[PDB]
Design an enzyme around this catalytic site. Structure first.
Site, PDB file in Angstrom:
ATOM      1  N   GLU A  11      -5.119  21.288  10.686  1.00  0.00           N
ATOM      2  CA  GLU A  11      -5.581  20.238   9.804  1.00  0.00           C
ATOM      3  C   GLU A  11      -6.597  20.773   8.810  1.00  0.00           C
ATOM      4  O   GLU A  11      -6.865  21.998   8.676  1.00  0.00           O
ATOM      5  CB  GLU A  11      -6.240  19.230  10.698  1.00  0.00           C
ATOM      6  CG  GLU A  11      -5.238  18.049  11.001  1.00  0.00           C
ATOM      7  CD  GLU A  11      -4.982  17.163   9.679  1.00  0.00           C
ATOM      8  OE1 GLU A  11      -5.648  17.386   8.561  1.00  0.00           O
ATOM      9  OE2 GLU A  11      -4.166  16.149   9.803  1.00  0.00           O
ATOM     10  N   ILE A  46      -0.745   8.574   2.085  1.00  0.00           N
ATOM     11  CA  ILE A  46      -0.198   9.743   2.822  1.00  0.00           C
ATOM     12  C   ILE A  46      -0.855   9.718   4.203  1.00  0.00           C
ATOM     13  O   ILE A  46      -2.085   9.545   4.327  1.00  0.00           O
ATOM     14  CB  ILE A  46      -0.583  11.084   2.075  1.00  0.00           C
ATOM     15  CG1 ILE A  46      -0.060  11.025   0.664  1.00  0.00           C
ATOM     16  CG2 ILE A  46       0.014  12.280   2.840  1.00  0.00           C
ATOM     17  CD1 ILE A  46      -0.382  12.328  -0.145  1.00  0.00           C
ATOM     18  N   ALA A  47      -0.005   9.926   5.265  1.00  0.00           N
ATOM     19  CA  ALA A  47      -0.610  10.084   6.642  1.00  0.00           C
ATOM     20  C   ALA A  47       0.456  11.033   7.275  1.00  0.00           C
ATOM     21  O   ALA A  47       1.675  10.884   7.050  1.00  0.00           O
ATOM     22  CB  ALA A  47      -0.669   8.810   7.450  1.00  0.00           C
ATOM     23  N   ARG A  48       0.000  12.009   8.057  1.00  0.00           N
ATOM     24  CA  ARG A  48       0.966  12.978   8.612  1.00  0.00           C
ATOM     25  C   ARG A  48       2.009  12.332   9.538  1.00  0.00           C
ATOM     26  O   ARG A  48       1.713  11.360  10.249  1.00  0.00           O
ATOM     27  CB  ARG A  48       0.204  14.036   9.404  1.00  0.00           C
ATOM     28  CG  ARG A  48      -0.417  13.560  10.667  1.00  0.00           C
ATOM     29  CD  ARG A  48      -1.219  14.791  11.244  1.00  0.00           C
ATOM     30  NE  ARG A  48      -1.531  14.553  12.671  1.00  0.00           N
ATOM     31  CZ  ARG A  48      -2.689  14.916  13.271  1.00  0.00           C
ATOM     32  NH1 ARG A  48      -3.651  15.508  12.595  1.00  0.00           N
ATOM     33  NH2 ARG A  48      -2.839  14.733  14.583  1.00  0.00           N
ATOM     34  N   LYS A  81     -15.484   2.561   3.972  1.00  0.00           N
ATOM     35  CA  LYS A  81     -14.323   3.440   4.123  1.00  0.00           C
ATOM     36  C   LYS A  81     -14.399   4.729   3.312  1.00  0.00           C
ATOM     37  O   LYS A  81     -13.931   5.809   3.702  1.00  0.00           O
ATOM     38  CB  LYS A  81     -13.049   2.617   3.764  1.00  0.00           C
ATOM     39  CG  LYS A  81     -11.769   3.395   3.715  1.00  0.00           C
ATOM     40  CD  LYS A  81     -10.573   2.430   3.741  1.00  0.00           C
ATOM     41  CE  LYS A  81      -9.292   3.162   3.573  1.00  0.00           C
ATOM     42  NZ  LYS A  81      -9.255   3.868   2.217  1.00  0.00           N
ATOM     43  N   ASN A 110       0.897  -1.199   0.000  1.00  0.00           N
ATOM     44  CA  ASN A 110       0.000   0.000   0.000  1.00  0.00           C
ATOM     45  C   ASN A 110       0.909   1.214   0.000  1.00  0.00           C
ATOM     46  O   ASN A 110       1.921   1.308   0.743  1.00  0.00           O
ATOM     47  CB  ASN A 110      -0.863  -0.009   1.298  1.00  0.00           C
ATOM     48  CG  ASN A 110      -1.954   0.997   1.233  1.00  0.00           C
ATOM     49  OD1 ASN A 110      -1.867   2.153   1.768  1.00  0.00           O
ATOM     50  ND2 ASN A 110      -3.009   0.597   0.633  1.00  0.00           N
TER      51      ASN A 110
END
Ligand SMILES: Cc1cc2c3c(c1C)C(C)(C)CC=[N+]3c1c([nH]c(=O)[nH]c1=O)N2C[C@H](O)[C@H](O)[C@H](O)COP(=O)(O)O
Ligand SMILES: Cc1cc2c3c(c1C)C(C)(C)CC=[N+]3c1c([nH]c(=O)[nH]c1=O)N2C[C@H](O)[C@H](O)[C@H](O)COP(=O)(O)O
Ligand SMILES: [K+]
Ligand SMILES: [K+]
Ligand SMILES: [Mn+2]
Ligand SMILES: [Mn+2]
Ligand code: NA
EC number: 4.1.1.102
Lengths: 503, 503
Positions: free
Chosen positions: B285, B173-175, B394, B170
Site C-alpha cells: 500500500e 477509487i477503492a482497491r 473526512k 458517487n
C-alpha cells in the site's frame, strides 16, 4: 606525476581533486566580498567540483588563493564522499560507513606523535613575518554570507592550544573573524576542548596570555580529526599519525613552543585573552541561517607572528543549507564517536549517522534487532536508556533528536531514513522528551525561543522500531523495486530493460 | 491525426504520452504474476516512461493490455507532473501548485451533469457479456507485490454507487481483488463515501444487494476526481463535467440503472453485499509495506455482467514507496481540499501540499504571516484551531501530521520542507497531539500497534513557525545560493558559471 598522498599533503589533495575533474581553478578575478561565498554555495548545493579561486580581488601573489568546499559532496559516479575519503587516504569510492569504520579501527592503532623536521625542510617557514608586519586587514579574507558580523578568516583551519603542564595538545576547528589589523575573535565555548584548555591557563593566573597557533592547509587528515570530538586529554596529533601511518612532520612556532605542521600553507601565532573580549558574529551557520545582529562577546586572539608558503592557499567552508563541511565532517564525526559510545556502553547498535538533510540535528541509530530482542525490553525503557547515554555527553551536544530504526534501514540513504521516520513512529506517542539535558544553543528553535535563556531541554528519542521488532522476527515486504521482488526477477527486469523499449 | 482531448478520452491520454516519449509499448510476453508490478516499480522510482504491456501471458486479444503508472512522475524537461496535468487537459509543464489551484477554480464553474449518448456508438458496449459468461479468473489480472492476498484487478478504476433516493451518485477509487470467477472483494471503510452510500442501503434492508458498477479506462478527468474527497452529496460526475467544460457522455448499465462513461475500456456491473464478507488483502500500500498474512474480512461484490471495448486496456497503480498515484493523486487531492477547507474556515493559509517523501502522511500548510499576525494568537491556540478543523473531518482522515510553516518555504520542494521541519520546531514541545480523533488504519505505526484496536489518536500538529513570526516581521538570512545573496550576484554567478570552468 609523483605518488600523491592527499591525507598527508594539502597540495596532493588538491592535485588528486584535479585528477578526478573535481576541482575548478578559477583564474578570473573574484571578489572575497560575497562572491566567493556565493560560488561556494552554488557548488555545494549541486554537488559540483570544488572552486579554487586563484585570483582574488585584493590578493598579493602569495596571500592568498582560496580552496572552497574541501569536504563537499560530489557526483556518485566518482565516489560522492571522495573528498572526505581523500582526507584519510582512502579510495575515493569508499562509502561513509567505511570511512567511519576506518576511523574507529584507527583508535586501536599505535599512536604516532609528531616528528620535528628541520626548518629548511618546512614549506610553512618559507616567508616569516614578525609582529610589525602583521596586517590582517590587508588579507583578502572572505565575507561569506550577507549579514555576517565580519570577515571570517578561520573556517577550515586548525587551532593549536596546549595545557600549561604540556601533557595535552589539542587541535580543533572553531570559527574566527578578523577584528582589526592585529586581532581575531571567535567561538571559545563549553564543552569544547579549546575552552577547556583556555580555562586551564586561567586557573593558573594566565587568562590573558594563552599561547596559540592557527594553521591553514594542514595535512588533510589533521583538519578532519580537528573536527572530531575525540576524548578529553587525547592529543589529536597522535591519532592523526596513526591514521596517516606516519608521524605528522612539525616545526616549532617562531614565538612560542607550539609545534605546527611543516607543510601548512599559512601559520598565525600569538596569544589568546579570555578577559579581553569583542563582539563576534553573527555567522551563517550549520542550520542554514544568519540571525541578524545576534553577535555576542568572544575572546580576542592577538596575532604576533605569521609564516607562509609561496602562492599560499586558504581552504574555506561556507556553512548553510545542506550539504557542506558542517554536515559531512561535524555530523559524521559525531556519528563516529556515537558508534564508539554505543560500543562502550553495550547498546545493540550496528551503525550511526547524522543525515545531512537534517542539518546535523538528527542522529539515526541502526539497531541490531536480535540484540535488542535479547534485552527483552520495551520501547519506553530502551528510549530512556539510549537518551541517558547520549544526551549528557559532549558527543551528544549538537544532537536534538535520536531516531532508532531497525537493521533493514540503510541509514546512510535519506530516502530510507525519511520513509522509516514517517511510517514507523507515532507522532508524539513514540517520542520521549528529555527536558533537563543541555540544549544546543545554535539550534534555531532553541536560539529563537525562550529556551535560549534556560538552555535546557528540547531534545527527544524517537522510536521508529515496530513493537513486534522488540520481541521476534517480523518479516514484511518493502514495496520498492530492489527490495520488493526476488533477485532473479529484479535481474531479469534489469537485463530486458532496453529490449522492452526503455531509452 | 485527430485533435487530442486526454482529459475526456483515455485513449487520447495514451496517445499524448506516446507523443511526449513518455510511454513504452512492451510487445514481448510479460507475466501478470509479479513481472508487471516489478517493471512498474522500476519505472515509478526512476521517474521513467509509463509501461503499456500489450502482450500479457494469459491475455485474449481483447482482455487485456495493462497501462501502468498513469499518474507517476517523469522527467522535469517534459514537465514532471505532466501525466497528472493531462488528466485535466492542462499544459504538461503545469506545476502541481497550478494543478491544485486549477481544481479550486473549477469549483466555481457551472456543474455539468452527465449526458446520455447512444449505445450504438459507445465503445464500452462493443462486447457485452451476460452472467454465465463472467469468468474473472480467466482475466490476466496482475499479482502486483510479493505476499499480496490476491490478484488486484481494481487499482485504478472507478466504483459507481448511488443512494437509494437517487440524489447522489458517487464515483471513487477503492482497491479490489478477485476472489473467484464471479466475485471481487475490497475495502469499503468509513468515512469514505462508498461506505456511506452502502450504509444507506443497509438502513433500508438492502445491505446484501447494493447495485454497483466498476469502470476502467474512464475519462482521465473522472478517475482523478474519483480519487478526490469532494464534499458529501456532491456527485463527482457534475464536477468532472465542469473540469472538462462539457458533460461526461454516459450510457446505462445492462443490469441496473447506473450510468457509466461511454468511452470506458471495461465495465463490470453487479451487486455489493456488506454482510457477505471474504478475506481481503493484504495489499502493498501507499506507505510502502505488505504486512504478510494480515488480511481482514471485507465486503463481496458479485459481478453479473460485463462490457468492454475491442483491445481493452486496464490501467493499474502499484503502490509502495514514493512516488506513485497514491502520493501524487491521493496526497495532492487531499491537499486541494485542505486548501479549500482553510479558505472556508477562515485560516490564513496560502497553499497546502502532502510531500511524496512522507508517503502522504504529512500535510504542510504554508501560513501567510501577515494574516497570522492579524489574529494576535499564540502557537498553542493556532495549533489547536488548525488540528480541530482538519483532523475531525473526512479530508484529514489520511493525514497524521500537519506541519505549519511560514510563507518563506516553498512547500512543493521537499528540500525546503525538511529544512524548516528540523530547524524550526522543538521536538515534542512544539507538537500538539490529538488523542481523540479517528486514526488512519492503514498507517503502519497504527496497524502494527495496539492503536489498531482503538483507531483513535496518534495525530499531531507541529508548529514550525518561529514565535516571533506570530507577532511581527522577523528578517533572517537563508544560507543557500538563491536566497542568501543579492539577486544581482546570483545572476552574475549564473552568467559566469561556464566561463569559470564549470563543465
Ligand atoms: C568542520 C567545522 C567544525 C566546526 C566549525 C566549522 C567547521 C567547518 C565552521 C568554522 C565552518 C563553523 C564553525 N565551527 C565551529 C566548531 N566548533 C566550535 O566550537 N566552534 C565553531 O565555531 N566546529 C566543530 C568542532 O571542530 C568540533 O566540535 C570538534 O570536535 C571540536 O574539537 P574538540 O573536540 O577538540 O573540542
Ligand atoms: C488513487 C488511489 C486512491 C485510493 C486508492 C488507490 C489509488 C490508486 C489504490 C487502489 C491503488 C490503493 C487503494 N486506494 C483506496 C482509496 N480509498 C479507499 O477507501 N480504499 C482504497 O483501497 N483511495 C483513495 C480514495 O479514492 C479517496 O479517498 C477518494 O476521496 C474517495 O472518494 P470519496 O471521497 O467519494 O469517498
Ligand atoms: K578535535
Ligand atoms: K471521490
Ligand atoms: Mn580534542
Ligand atoms: Mn464522493
Ligand atoms: Na612568492
Amino acid at each position: 606525476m609523483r605518488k600523491l598522498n592527499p591525507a598527508l599533503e594539502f597540495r596532493d589533495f588538491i592535485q588528486v581533486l584535479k585528477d578526478e575533474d573535481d576541482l575548478i581553478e578559477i583564474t578570473e578575478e573574484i571578489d572575497p566580498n560575497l562572491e566567493v561565498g556565493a560560488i561556494m554555495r552554488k557548488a555545494y548545493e549541486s554537488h559540483l567540483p570544488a572552486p579554487l579561486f586563484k585570483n582574488l580581488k585584493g590578493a598579493s601573489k602569495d596571500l592568498f588563493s582560496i580552496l572552497g568546499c574541501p569536504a563537499g559532496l560530489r557526483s556518485k559516479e566518482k565516489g560522492d564522499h571522495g573528498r572526505i575519503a581523500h582526507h584519510l587516504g582512502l579510495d575515493p569510492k569508499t562509502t561513509i560507513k567505511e570511512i567511519i569504520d576506518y576511523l574507529l579501527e584507527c583508535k586501536e592503532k599505535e599512536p604516532l606523535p609528531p616528528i620535528t623536521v628541520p626548518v629548511s625542510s618546512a614549506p610553512c617557514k618559507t616567508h616569516i613575518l614578525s609582529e610589525e608586519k602583521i596586517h590582517l586587514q590587508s588579507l583578502p579574507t572572505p565575507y561569506l554570507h550577507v549579514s555576517d558580523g565580519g570577515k571570517y578568516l578561520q573556517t577550515y583551519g586548525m587551532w593549536i592550544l596546549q595545557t600549561p603542564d604540556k601533557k595535552w595538545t589539542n587541535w580543533s576547528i572553531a570559527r574566527g573573524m578578523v577584528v582589526d589589523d592585529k586581532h581575531i575573535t571567535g567561538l571559545v565555548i563549553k564543552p569544547q576542548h579549546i575552552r577547556q584548555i583556555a580555562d586551564s591557563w586561567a586557573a593558573i593566573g594566565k587568562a590573558n596570555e594563552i599561547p596559540f597557533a592557527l594553521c591553514f592547509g594542514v595535512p588533510p587528515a589533521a583538519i578532519l580529526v580537528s573536527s572530531m570530538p575525540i576524548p578529553e586529554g587525547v592529543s589529536e596529533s597522535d591519532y592523526v599519525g596513526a591514521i596517516l601511518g606516519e608521524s605528522v612532520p612539525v616545526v616549532k612556532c617562531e614565538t612560542n613552543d607550539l609545534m605546527v605542521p611543516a607543510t601548512s600553507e599559512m601559520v598565525f601565532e600569538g596569544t589568546l585573552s579570555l578577559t579581553d573580549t569583542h563582539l563576534e558574529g553573527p555567522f551563517g551557520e550549520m542550520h542554514g541561517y544568519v540571525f541578524k545582529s545576534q553577535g555576542h562577546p568572544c575572546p580576542l586572539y592577538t596575532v604576533k607572528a605569521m609564516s607562509y608558503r609561496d602562492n599560499a592557499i586558504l581552504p574555506v567552508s561556507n556553512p548553510g543549507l545542506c550539504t557542506d563541511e558542517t554536515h559531512t565532517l561535524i555530523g559524521s564525526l559525531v556519528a563516529t564517536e556515537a558508534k564508539e559510545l554505543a560500543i562502550e556502553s553495550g547498546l545493540p547498535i550496528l551503525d550511526a549517522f547524522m543525515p545531512y538533510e537534517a542539518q546535523a540535528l538528527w542522529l539515526i541509530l541502526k539497531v541490531d534487532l536480535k540484540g535488542l530482542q535479547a534485552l527483552k525490553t520495551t520501547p519506553e525503557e530502551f528510549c530512556k536508556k539510549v537518551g541517558d547515554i547520549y544526551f549528557r555527553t559532549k558527543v551528544g551536544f549538537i544532537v536534538h533528536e535520536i531516531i532508532l530504526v531497525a537493521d533493514d534501514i540503510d541509514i546512510f540513504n535519506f530516502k530510507e531514513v525519511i520513509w522509516a521516520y514517517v511510517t514507523r513512529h507515532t507522532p508524539v506517542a513514540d517520542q520521549m522528551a528529555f527536558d533537563d539535558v543541555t540544549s544546543f544553543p545554535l539550534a534555531p528553535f532553541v536560539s529563537q525561543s525562550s529556551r535560549s535563556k534556560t538552555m535546557k531541554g528540547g531534545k527527544c528519542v524517537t522510536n521508529c522500531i515496530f513493537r513486534q521488532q522488540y520481541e521476534r522476527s517480523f518479516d514484511y515486504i518493502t514495496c520498492n523495486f530492489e527490495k520488493g521482488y526476488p533477485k532473479g526477477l529484479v535481474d531479469k527486469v534489469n537485463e530486458n530493460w532496453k529490449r522492452y523499449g526503455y531509452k
